[PDB]
């Protein structure tokens, strides 16, 4: 159920390896990524963190799990604010 | 194997008409290839964003007919004959503008009429632009080229009306430079109570993306309301205020509006060949009528006020 | 008196307002509008440089059509059909088939802008653009219609876009990608800027030059009149482009222009290239395809792109090499597989034509000339089975056109392949592969004609099965050599014993 | 190719492309008259003529009306203006073809 | 055992679909491709026809079968002369 | 009397012969020689423009070394180690580690040409090239050797290339691709032309300028002396390139140059960029990294490429954008993950340095400045856990360097992914992905450091496990902030209650 | 955890030598990182072409030792000391050239000697170039940097000899312009019987790609043959023909040749620490000796002929 | 970027880059003397000096020996010639830095 992704957080300078869980919601995924960015290189801010496939327009629902998303291990995601 | 076949007198799709095809038939019929393949309207990935848009908002519309292509514009207008017709009507309107300006018509209107015009007439450019944008949407989504062509000409007619309104707002400002003419229309459209029913109606109508709902709300609800509650009441008020140009201008605009009503009714008649469509069209009319009624009531109470 | 347009024009485009009953994003959804997050207020500075207004439009367009139709009427008895070189007649057939219903599709690109662009001047100019493309579709159906009674291949002026014929698939994949399948700002950049100030000048003016030389004034007059509208509505692109650059979207703008220009190039190399350098009779070739490319695309179009602040496309040098090579091979492919076309390709390889080709493309005879040598020998020796194909060409998963290269003495061919989501795709250039990778969701489940043949979508699996799948209804409709091989009579005869 | 294409790209030629008809000669003449001390180049392609000057080329309504020999409004030029090189700026009095950059 | 390849023959102008057999030798593959090229657009010539993965340097042995080669269906091959 | 070189030089390279007992291809196998089928006779026109001969070589190279070693000896007591800014000392550590054993690898690139090039002048010049790179490897081990007794990080002058430390992997993947892993003609084009007339001038002369400003003349004198050899043996590339173009191989030549320049760029952006704009003390920055790029790479190198008949690379505009952006992010990555480096990165973000960065790269403070703001706040508030990483960066499958983008106010980041043979690869640019696709057999089963971590090759799976896997032997060897965060003392203090 | 450790006086890999490391040790030892990973010599795909080449021709060589890096050049030469040594020997040779030219040495040789030189001496540039190319091959393939360095200096020495031969061929041509000196050497190398044993030997040796076989054939078979059957016989003939420069020149070249023999013997001694290697080295010597013997015999019969 | 990079690329500057030491001043002086009616530009980077002229720049052995003040052979320049702009052609008498093309 360990599931590696590569994640780019909004306003950060890089993409990082973040190992999430197959059964994680997108809300949970966003939080696991934010851990490695917010208050490290990215200023905290108000708003709702959302997950999308890298460079996509369409956002994954907040409640959707990694398993439900159709994402493959080691694919790239962005975490952005809506 | 393959056959040896002789030439046809017209397009293969018209070759079994009994009548000689008209110019209208030759240049207007069965041109949307995007309806040929239900799974891929456009020649792209079947689930490309625009393919999904068309599968949802055209193909899946509850308004259904097995032969939308057989729809015929009652006026059988093509680009060429539209321009002949409209150059006639528009040269007539431009000649009225010239002549009435020569006679200094705007100076002879009843005291205060410029303020009524600033408030109830000049912001119509926003309303007419909304009709223009909406007509273009029905164009791009309609399931037959003969339907789309009617929408194309209707989109042009909406811009015609917008342009008359722009020209006359400017012209009136020249006689009456202290009325806000050409300066305050956005503020009125956004903030004035008499415009808010109309603004709410159009913002919501422009977000009705199903082709059938777009068509019915625009052409069967919104546009006839404009005729009975905006155009005709303005003609009456103009008569009471010794504005003799506005009634003539509106009469020309009403010719366009009647044409839009004619083709739209013809489309309904075509659609009702499918009995299921009656409840569908009725449902949307009943959905949108209250909003249109509120819009008309708010406008009329503004036109009536001091 | 009348007041001049300059005094009331601004009111005609004072049409933006701040939405209150729905959100800005609901009214202008990104997937349809393509505003890239640029707010409404910023779009109000959009200023179309080539303006018109409703009264002028109806008056002037009335005059444009009066001339086009009058010239047609006056020349009905000029015997263009019966007296023209058949290569010229095939040029008409390929033009009307490839273009007429696509022009009508362009109405939808203009309509997309008229509803969904955040720039008010763009919405109005796009309304005239809708009207213009309606004109172009109607003209380009009306004109060939009179030839239906003479030749079933003219039915394709209407039929092509309703078919799965390979060249029709190529046309639709291009037009559906750049015109009808993307958001309003993409259309503004890709169609009006990239396509309508670029490649349409080749088919509608370059070709008009050849038409005039060929004495076909009905056609020359028609297509040049059409281009006068294009020259106006195409000027919607520049201001969109300048706005995107001003608002931090240069990179996005450049990518879209780069993509659209390449996509247009490959289609025009298959349509216009063989027309200009092979189907048009030698005496009527005003300039070569490459000379016209240097005039219209390099000298005019690309110079305009630089003036507006964009860069030369990354693939510049590949493009220049392609201009020297690609259409010669596409011509070869279309001619060898002529039975799959709705027009009759002229081979265009008589000695005098080969001398011209050598002058215009030094080295031609040691390259394409090698293949035409084998073909010519076969024709002269009546070995006709060897001049017709018994398999399919491999086809690009972007352009939908055969995968080609340079034949003969310095043979070079390259296919650019890609695995994506557990499927293997093949492209005719680095640039085509790059286009796919820019937007895979647009393309990923599309199947080209070869993919369909291999998947069992084309039944039966024979030349005949494919031809029927492609919409052919009779022997008469399928392409033949334009001159029924009478061109071999100008080649040195193949001697036999006496 | 390289040298040939570079030379083709690095031009500053601007001006109208006029479609065969009654505007060809009047536009050529107007280009000459309205741009004194600009050399005007003309390339004849029978179906169209390519008229150009370096950097800027103006056509005034008044000159065009004189050279054409009949009443003429500037907007009417679009009946015959098939294309153009340069950016365009047009009003009731004249049309200007121009470039912002020098290549 | 039908096996589609896309093949580019030496001195020809295009790549073509050629359906071979899984159990075909490279000698047999080359011949099946040559059918659609030699004496059609390519002059016949002396020499041994060889098969390679497209744009490769390394040639497949003459005796090797399609099955043995590791080629996947619809991959591109060249047929050249050694 | 002695006879001048011009009179007997031709005999020194009259060494080609026609093989009889083995074939030409057996003696010069394409996989090692890279002759692209060009026959022996054609290679005899190869004419190296920068010649030498054995007696001159040994005499002159004796003098070069006498000077380099004498200056070292005379300056041993200048207290460079103890008195230099630690950012300067880290520059020495990163230089010798990244370069010394790679120079010795370059012997093999030269040896590849000395045995396998079909051009006799190339085989002789490459023999001097072998000798030159031997000199460079030996100098660049001897020089740092004396610092071993002072600082374990100098052990990496020898150790780096024997490690799996991430930057060492990046260096080896580059050098093994362009120097030791390809045929002789590829080496001639890629190493000597692309790399040795291009990027080495930045690290060996640009950096020499900064060294002289910093008062480190031993180092400035050393690296400039080394470059005098490079300037001679690099002139093997031009004649190879001209020969390939003359023999119909322009396209192949251009592709190799394009590939090698980009590969060199990404490595040099991670090594030299942070050195020039951050580690070198502000007072010693002769020019910015970008200014030096414009001098050496744009103004000199690319102009030379055009003079020899090549085209600007297709990615020109991407490259220009990268020069403004890439190294700022690579610096950030190397500093944040400093514990994985064998040198101590200087942050280089005191207010006075930030003013300089803004001057040299307008907009810097609203981009990278945003990240350094957060970092600076944490340092001032003693929130040190937030200045050290708890995960891995994602890494390019070509360059072996973190995947980065522009941070801050106009955030933009892009990863260019590729599926190939049922594996997913990720690249830091369009160009890196393109390089992979040019030669997949070179790269396809290579695993980057992240791929290894995910595959269970790095045990245990922790910062510590990775650090040990990378060859670190003590706390002292792993990178720290150069100034132990004393730079925060120049930032406005974070106030607390009294 | 991680330790805190103190600095080492030298490289970590030398830190447990008892002696203070020399310049030679510091700059020469254990520099081929390509031997670290048996499955991927180079930092590329494990089966990239060059990785396959090195796995086959270096790693899989039957000549095996568990510590090739411990090999030491007996002369412990580095770049710096090679150039000091060779500038000394080469300045000496160049001074001989100058002086003997001043004294018009070439005019005083026995009648016909120029023809012997044209036939048996001037084509040595081809042979020496073959030694140069071969030495470079052993350089790039040898499994230790200390071995490779010896090959680098040997490659330079081969070019030294080639260059002496070029210079002297040209110089002799100035006194004897009608002997084909500097004109006919390729033809002799290709066609002359006395050169064909040597040419066959080198063409085959240059296609022996296993590092061990390359080393043994080049350094233990070919090079010693050159010493005993070419260099020394030429000195004897020169003495008989009153050529007093050639014996002195060859004596300097022989200093180089002896050095190559010294390091090569040291490598054999190192290799024989593994008893398996004796049969391997013996096998290759026995394989190549007949070819070298034929080469020498053909050369000598040409040198002896009229 | 675009304008800046174009200007940087479109130069015809050729000449030696000399590494700090005893050849810096003599080479500057020789460049001036041996190229009369060429403007010589010098950029001082302390560790090296960048010496240039438009299109061609010659350094003769005889001039360099005079400016250096001691016996000098042309090949010895490589002790101090760290890089150069332009193509190179060298013999016993002189070195020539040059371009074939004009940008
Ligand atoms: Fe059109
Ligand atoms: Fe258009
Ligand atoms: Fe080096
Ligand atoms: Fe080097």
Curated annotation (Swiss-Prot), chains A, E:
Catalytic activity: toluene + NADH + O2 + H(+) = 4-methylphenol + NAD(+) + H2O
Gene3D superfamilies with a match to the protein in the record: TmoB-like (3.10.20.270)
A Pfam family it matches: TmoB
A GO biological process held by the record: toluene catabolic process
SUPFAM superfamilies cross-referenced by the UniProt entry: TmoB-like
Superkingdom of origin organism: Bacteria
Regulation: Inhibited by Zn(2+) and Cu(2+).
Pathway the protein contributes to: Xenobiotic degradation; toluene degradation
Activity vs pH: Optimum pH is 6.8.
Keyword NAD recorded: yes
Loss of function: phenotype: Cells lacking this gene show a complete loss of toluene-4-monooxygenase activity.
EC supergroup of this enzyme: oxidoreductase
EC number: 1.14.13.236
Entry GO MF terms: toluene 4-monooxygenase activity
Keywords attached to this entry: Aromatic hydrocarbons catabolism, Monooxygenase, NAD, Oxidoreductase
Subunit organization: The alkene monooxygenase multicomponent enzyme system is composed of an electron transfer component and a monooxygenase component interacting with the effector protein TmoD. The electron transfer component is composed of a ferredoxin reductase (TmoF) and a ferredoxin (TmoC), and the monooxygenase component is formed by a heterohexamer (dimer of heterotrimers) of two alpha subunits (TmoA), two beta subunits (TmoE) and two gamma subunits (TmoB).
Protein family per UniProt: Belongs to the TmoB/XamoB family.
Function, in words: Component of the toluene-4-monooxygenase multicomponent enzyme system which catalyzes the O2- and NADH-dependent hydroxylation of toluene to form p-cresol. Also able to convert benzene to phenol, catechol, and 1,2,3-trihydroxybenzene by successive hydroxylations.
Name by which UniProt lists this protein: Toluene-4-monooxygenase system, hydroxylase component subunit gamma
Gene encoding the protein: tmoB
UniProtKB/Swiss-Prot annotation, chains B, G:
EC number(s) from the headed UniProt entry: 1.14.13.236
Claim: DNA repair is one of the keywords in the record: no
Phenotypic consequence of gene deletion: Cells lacking this gene show a complete loss of toluene-4-monooxygenase activity.
InterPro entries membership: Ferritin-like_SF, MP_mOase_hydro, Phenol_Hydrox, RNR-like
Catalytic activity: toluene + NADH + O2 + H(+) = 4-methylphenol + NAD(+) + H2O
Pathway stated in the Swiss-Prot or TrEMBL entry: Xenobiotic degradation; toluene degradation
MF (Gene Ontology): toluene 4-monooxygenase activity
pH dependence, entry free text: Optimum pH is 6.8.
Activity regulation, short description: Inhibited by Zn(2+) and Cu(2+).
KW Signal (keyword) present: no
Keywords: Aromatic hydrocarbons catabolism, Monooxygenase, NAD, Oxidoreductase
Record-level GO BP terms: toluene catabolic process
Annotated Pfam families: Phenol_Hydrox (PF02332)
Family label: Belongs to the TmoE/XamoE family.
Quaternary structure note: The alkene monooxygenase multicomponent enzyme system is composed of an electron transfer component and a monooxygenase component interacting with the effector protein TmoD. The electron transfer component is composed of a ferredoxin reductase (TmoF) and a ferredoxin (TmoC), and the monooxygenase component is formed by a heterohexamer (dimer of heterotrimers) of two alpha subunits (TmoA), two beta subunits (TmoE) and two gamma subunits (TmoB).
Function: Component of the toluene-4-monooxygenase multicomponent enzyme system which catalyzes the O2- and NADH-dependent hydroxylation of toluene to form p-cresol. Also able to convert benzene to phenol, catechol, and 1,2,3-trihydroxybenzene by successive hydroxylations.
From Swiss-Prot, chains C, F:
Disulfide bonds listed in the record: none
Substitution effect: residue 102 to L: Increases production of m-cresol, instread of p-cresol
Disruption phenotype: Cells lacking this gene show a complete loss of toluene-4-monooxygenase activity.
Keywords, ordered alphabetically: Aromatic hydrocarbons catabolism, Iron, Metal-binding, Monooxygenase, NAD, Oxidoreductase
Highest taxon in the source lineage: Bacteria
Regulation: Inhibited by Zn(2+) and Cu(2+).
Amino-acid positions noted as binding Fe cation 1 in the UniProt annotation, renumbered to this chain: 103, 133, 136, 230
Name of this protein: Toluene-4-monooxygenase system, hydroxylase component subunit alpha
Species this chain originates from: Ectopseudomonas mendocina (Pseudomonas mendocina)
UniProtKB/Swiss-Prot annotation, chains D, H:
One example GO MF annotation: monooxygenase activity
UniProt-recorded name of the protein: Toluene-4-monooxygenase system, effector component
Disulfide bonding pattern of the chain: none
Description of how the protein assembles with itself and partners: The alkene monooxygenase multicomponent enzyme system is composed of an electron transfer component and a monooxygenase component interacting with the effector protein TmoD. The electron transfer component is composed of a ferredoxin reductase (TmoF) and a ferredoxin (TmoC), and the monooxygenase component is formed by a heterohexamer (dimer of heterotrimers) of two alpha subunits (TmoA), two beta subunits (TmoE) and two gamma subunits (TmoB).
Function according to Swiss-Prot or TrEMBL: Effector component of the toluene-4-monooxygenase multicomponent enzyme system which catalyzes the O2- and NADH-dependent hydroxylation of toluene to form p-cresol. Required for optimal efficiency and specificity of the holoenzyme.
Family assignment from sequence similarity: Belongs to the TmoD/XamoD family.
Recorded phenotype for the gene knockout or disruption: Cells lacking this gene show a complete loss of toluene-4-monooxygenase activity.
The keyword Zinc appears for this protein: no
UniProt keyword annotations, A-Z: Aromatic hydrocarbons catabolism
BP-aspect Gene Ontology terms: toluene catabolic process
The organism's place on the tree of life at top rank: Bacteria
Gene3D superfamilies according to UniProt: Monooxygenase component MmoB/DmpM
InterPro entries: MOase_MmoB_DmpM, mOase_MmoB_DmpM_sf
Pathway assigned to this chain's UniProt record: Xenobiotic degradation; toluene degradation
